[PDB]
Amino acid sequence: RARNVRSHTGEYAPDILVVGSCFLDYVGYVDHMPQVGETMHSVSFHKGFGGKGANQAVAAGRLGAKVAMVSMVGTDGDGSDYIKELERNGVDTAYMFRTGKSSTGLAMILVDTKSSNNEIVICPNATNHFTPELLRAQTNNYERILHTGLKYLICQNEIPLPTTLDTIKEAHSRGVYTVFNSAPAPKPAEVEQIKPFLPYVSLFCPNEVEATLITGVKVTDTESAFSAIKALQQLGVRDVVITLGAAGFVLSENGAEPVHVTGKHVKAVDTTGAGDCFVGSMVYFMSRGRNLLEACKRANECAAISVTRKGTQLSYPHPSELPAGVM
Amino acid sequence: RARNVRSHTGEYAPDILVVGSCFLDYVGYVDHMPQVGETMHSVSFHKGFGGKGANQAVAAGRLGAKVAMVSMVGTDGDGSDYIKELERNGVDTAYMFRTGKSSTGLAMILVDTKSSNNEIVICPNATNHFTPELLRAQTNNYERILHTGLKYLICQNEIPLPTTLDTIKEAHSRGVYTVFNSAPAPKPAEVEQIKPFLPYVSLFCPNEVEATLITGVKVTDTESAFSAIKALQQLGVRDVVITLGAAGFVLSENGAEPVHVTGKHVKAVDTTGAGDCFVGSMVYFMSRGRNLLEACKRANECAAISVTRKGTQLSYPHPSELPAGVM
Numbered sequence: 001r002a003r004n005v006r007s008h009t010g011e012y013a014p015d016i017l018v019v020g021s022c023f024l025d026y027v028g029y030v031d032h033m034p035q036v037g038e039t040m041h042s043v044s045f046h047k048g049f050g051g052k053g054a055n056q057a058v059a060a061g062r063l064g065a066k067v068a069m070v071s072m073v074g075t076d077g078d079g080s081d082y083i084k085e086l087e088r089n090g091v092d093t094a095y096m097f098r099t100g101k102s103s104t105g106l107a108m109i110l111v112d113t114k115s116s117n118n119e120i121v122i123c124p125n126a127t128n129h130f131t132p133e134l135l136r137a138q139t140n141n142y143e144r145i146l147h148t149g150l151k152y153l154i155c156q157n158e159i160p161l162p163t164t165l166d167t168i169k170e171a172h173s174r175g176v177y178t179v180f181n182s183a184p185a186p187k188p189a190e191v192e193q194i195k196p197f198l199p200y201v202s203l204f205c206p207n208e209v210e211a212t213l214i215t216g217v218k219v220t221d222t223e224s225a226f227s228a229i230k231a232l233q234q235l236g237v238r239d240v241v242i243t244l245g246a247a248g249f250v251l252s253e254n255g256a257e258p259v260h261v262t263g264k265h266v267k268a269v270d271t272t273g274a275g276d277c278f279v280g281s282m283v284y285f286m287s288r289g290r291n292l293l294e295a296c297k298r299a300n301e302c303a304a305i306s307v308t309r310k311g312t313q314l315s316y317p318h319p320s321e322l323p324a325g326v327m
Numbered sequence: 328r329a330r331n332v333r334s335h336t337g338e339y340a341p342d343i344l345v346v347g348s349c350f351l352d353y354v355g356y357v358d359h360m361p362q363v364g365e366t367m368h369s370v371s372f373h374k375g376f377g378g379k380g381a382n383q384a385v386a387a388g389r390l391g392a393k394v395a396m397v398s399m400v401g402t403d404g405d406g407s408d409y410i411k412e413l414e415r416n417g418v419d420t421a422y423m424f425r426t427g428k429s430s431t432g433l434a435m436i437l438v439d440t441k442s443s444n445n446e447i448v449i450c451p452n453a454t455n456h457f458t459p460e461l462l463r464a465q466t467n468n469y470e471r472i473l474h475t476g477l478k479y480l481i482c483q484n485e486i487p488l489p490t491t492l493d494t495i496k497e498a499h500s501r502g503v504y505t506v507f508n509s510a511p512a513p514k515p516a517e518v519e520q521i522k523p524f525l526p527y528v529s530l531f532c533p534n535e536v537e538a539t540l541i542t543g544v545k546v547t548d549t550e551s552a553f554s555a556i557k558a559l560q561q562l563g564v565r566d567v568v569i570t571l572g573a574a575g576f577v578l579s580e581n582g583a584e585p586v587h588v589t590g591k592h593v594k595a596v597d598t599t600g601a602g603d604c605f606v607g608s609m610v611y612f613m614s615r616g617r618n619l620l621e622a623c624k625r626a627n628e629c630a631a632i633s634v635t636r637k638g639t640q641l642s643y644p645h646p647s648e649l650p651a652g653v654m
């Protein structure tokens with residue numbers, strides 16, 4: 001067994017539960033993108049640990065969060081590598097499910113360094129089998145993973161949507177603070193199904209695009225983002241945060257006047273996974289007892305630091321690396 | 328340890344040694360090839376076990392060969408998966424090397440079923456570090472892997488060329504029968520380095536293109552294949568076999584009059600890895616004491632069965648599938 005084991009006495013039960021995606025990133029660096037029919041060699045290759053779910057759990061885990069990952073991987077070596085990597089990043093793996101019928105989810109990523117361009121084929125694989133019915137069957141209808149002591153749920157939109165919406169509803173009904181990062185951007189049919197579950201979303205935390213698609217409010221800047229915030233309170237979301245890249249974020253705690261905090265000024269070398277860093281860091285700081293604005297201010301600093309280095313999860317800070325006054 | 332362990336006496340020492348490549352094949356099925364900058368999902372995914380070295384060892388292992396794979400893979404789960412798969416296909420893994428500094432070799436393969444076009448990026452990864460110096464350091468200057476019992480070495484051209492050439496020379500100097508399948512096709516500077524090593528090759532087994540590049544004879548058919556055989560005997564190769572796809576193969580055993588045997592008449596579904604199947608089968612049948620012609624007739628039948636099914640190693644025959652008199 002690679003995975004963690006629960007106690008009979010609930011003594012390692014987490015503060016934060018992440019129900020979402022784990023994907024291996026197969027990154028081939030190419031002199032050119034291949035044309036139809038082409039066989040070519042990479043110049044280099046890098047194996048990474050991705051999926052927005054795992055990225056968020058690892059951002060929190062790296063700052064010391066009592067965080068557990070709930071997901072589906074293979075019985076393959078990739079799954080075993082992911083389970084150990086989560087543990088080395090401070091994430092509990094007791095509720096990582098494994099199937100012998102599917103490979104671990106992965107992204108096949110080609111990077112042209114010269115052109116900086118990317119081609120990506122997502123192969124969710126085992127992730128496609130991470131259904132509400134399997135989740136229920138393995139957790140006694142959510143009782144094994146939604147203990148009384150559970151403070152936060154984080155979901156994204158990189159597993160089957162019904163698993164995301166049913167988990168958010170069940171966690172909200174038990175008084176868990178539910179965080180939903182609607183990434184990648186929901187398609188029109190996904191928006192129709194999300195909208196009725198927004199009353200169960202304690203914190204909705206999209207980027208500009210994702211806010212635009214859910215609200216119909218075109219978000220390009222602060223003023224429009226404040227409109228999108230009001231629209232999401234109307235759809236029944238208690239707390240709203242919208243990230244704005246280098247422009248930082250806007251938020252509203254329980255319908256109080258919006259706030260803009262701008263981005264940190266930093267030399268951005270590689271922004272990959274910055275948003276996942278922001279979300280996981282934000283929830284970590286709220287679990288330590290920070291209010292939403294104090295949490296998001298520090299999450300903004302953590303994400304700024306991540307964009308100064310390559311590596312997605314490898315660019316997420318540990319507490320010893322942070323400048324004084326972040327932790 | 329997933330890998331086999333050699334015994335103090337060497338009671339499980341192999342008849343056939345394969346020194347070559349192990350690549351995982353990561354196959355993403357797509358509705359269209361990705362354009363520069365595109366992120367898409369696959370319609371389907373398949374993980375296969377490839378690399379010409381491993382393909383040739385597994386063709387032999389599936390028929391019951393006492394074969395051992397010498398290669399480099401990662402300490403990653405993909406390396407552990409390959410080592411187990413080799414064992415399940417009757418290949419000894421005691422001299423599989425593992426590096427913590429590189430991933431397991433792999434091919435990232437995109438297949439558009441509709442257009443039936445491919446895009447392939449080959450990531451040799453750990454294979455690029457499988458050097459003569461590393462091999463000598465790990466095997467006491469080849470003593471550990473070239474024991475007196477050893478009858479056959481098979482090499483290809485899918486690992487650093489100096490590793491392939493030095494292994495052939497050392498094996499042939501010990502009275503091992505050396506088999507060299509110069510695939511993939513040698514580049515002009517690789518042809519120049521190979522030619523002085525041909526006197527140390529017992530059996531050169533190219534396809535038409537490879538025979539063309541090595542000899543300067545334009546090989547397109549039986550007649551020109553026969554010319555290429557003479558040119559190879561002049562460069563000091565003892566036994567030559569040239570495979571001709573659907574037109575079967577030509578050979579000469581040690582300067583004797585060359586022989587043409589045509590292709591089996593079969594419904595070709597997927598020819599992928601047929602050549603590897605032919606080469607591995609051929610050497611198994613010679614280890615059973617068939618002469619070159621008898622071994623190649625049986626290999627031709629094995630490769631013909633393989634072209635009737637998809638899946639590369641999954642299409643290689645077991646002994647129950649072979650007509651009477653082949654085994």
Ligand SMILES: Nc1ncnc2c1ncn2[C@@H]1O[C@H](COP(=O)(O)OP(=O)(O)CP(=O)(O)O)[C@@H](O)[C@H]1O
Binds near residue numbers: 273
């Ligand atoms: N150039 C930059 N400078 C400072 N902070 C940045 C930044 N880019 C991103 N951030 C920080 O990261 C947070 C999320 O930004 P964004 O949503 O662009 O991430 P992302 O993960 O979508 C980038 P990518 O599209 O490459 O994956 C921002 O709210 C901000 O805190």
Ligand SMILES: Nc1ncnc2c1ncn2[C@@H]1O[C@H](COP(=O)(O)OP(=O)(O)CP(=O)(O)O)[C@@H](O)[C@H]1O
Binds near residue numbers: 592597599602
């Ligand atoms: N269409 C066909 N019909 C019958 N036998 C065939 C065949 N194609 C290949 N073979 C068998 O396989 C041997 C090697 O064929 P070839 O060298 O084309 O395989 P290959 O692995 O290079 C095909 P691919 O280019 O798809 O990887 C032949 O000598 C023959 O025994």
Ligand SMILES: [Cl-]
Binds near residue numbers: 002003083
């Ligand atoms: Cl496990």
Ligand SMILES: [Cl-]
Binds near residue numbers: 313
């Ligand atoms: Cl990583």
Ligand SMILES: [Cl-]
Binds near residue numbers: 103126372
């Ligand atoms: Cl799969």
Ligand SMILES: [Cl-]
Binds near residue numbers: 313314315
């Ligand atoms: Cl790190």
Ligand SMILES: [Cl-]
Binds near residue numbers: 328329410
């Ligand atoms: Cl091992």
Ligand SMILES: [Cl-]
Binds near residue numbers: 375638639
């Ligand atoms: Cl396979």
Ligand SMILES: [Cl-]
Binds near residue numbers: 045428452
């Ligand atoms: Cl590598």
Ligand code: NA
Binds near residue numbers: 061062063064065090
């Ligand atoms: Na920790």
Ligand code: NA
Binds near residue numbers: 066067
């Ligand atoms: Na932790």
Ligand code: NA
Binds near residue numbers: 272274306308309311
């Ligand atoms: Na980064």
Ligand code: NA
Binds near residue numbers: 388390391392417
């Ligand atoms: Na066997």
Ligand code: NA
Binds near residue numbers: 388392393416417419
């Ligand atoms: Na065997």
Ligand code: NA
Binds near residue numbers: 634635637639
């Ligand atoms: Na086949």
